[PDB]
């Protein structure tokens, strides 16, 4: 069977939506109901990873920009980055480790743990208009819990 994907949007537990901050960055802010179309639409693929009832291995891409979210060690820091890919080759079932996130549902909210960096999560700051980043905890002050809205397809 070939790789399957669904279109969706993310909203953190504090109701912040995700938008393009630049060509290779995402930021999080509260959008008015009329500005919702500025939010990024992700192509979420169900990829190869650890067989778990809790963790669902996924890859998150931005189809129109040929980008995938990826986790890389930048100098001494595990870092969330947007990486360009060849759309003729991606998505695929066997996504390289840097592209894999373990999607975990907890109290009806979603967390996205980096497979490359266990215990590191897709995170937002409590402050407005700050970049989306990789955070070293699902706890503390930063936000790691989201809701997903699927887009008609």
């Amino acid at each position: 069977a070939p790789v399957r994907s669904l279109n969706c949007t993310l909203r953190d537990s504090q109701q912040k939506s995700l938008v393009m901050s630049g060509p290779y960055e995402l930021k999080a802010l509260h959008l008015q109901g009329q500005d919702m179309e500025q939010q990024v639409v992700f192509s979420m693929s169900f990829v190869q990873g650890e067989e778990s009832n809790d963790k669902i291995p996924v890859a998150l891409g931005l189809k129109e920009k040929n980008l995938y979210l990826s986790c890389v060690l930048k100098d001494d820091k595990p870092t969330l980055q947007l990486e360009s890919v060849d759309p003729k080759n991606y998505p695929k079932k066997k996504m390289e480790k840097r592209f894999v996130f373990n999607k975990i549902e907890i109290n009806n909210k979603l967390e996205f743990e980096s497979a490359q960096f266990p215990n590191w999560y897709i995170s937002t700051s409590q402050a407005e208009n700050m970049p989306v980043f990789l955070g070293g905890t699902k706890g503390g002050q930063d936000i790691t819990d989201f809701t997903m809205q699927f887009v008609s397809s």
């Binding site: 070939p2 790789v3 399957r4 994907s5 669904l6 279109n7 192509s43 891409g61 189809k63 040929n66 759309p87 003729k88 080759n89 991606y90 998505p91 695929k92 008609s152 397809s153």
Partner: peptide, 14 residues
Amino acid sequence: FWDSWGYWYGPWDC
């Protein structure tokens, strides 16, 4: 391509 249930199968450029 989009199947009858709304899943996109294969790469972005099939």
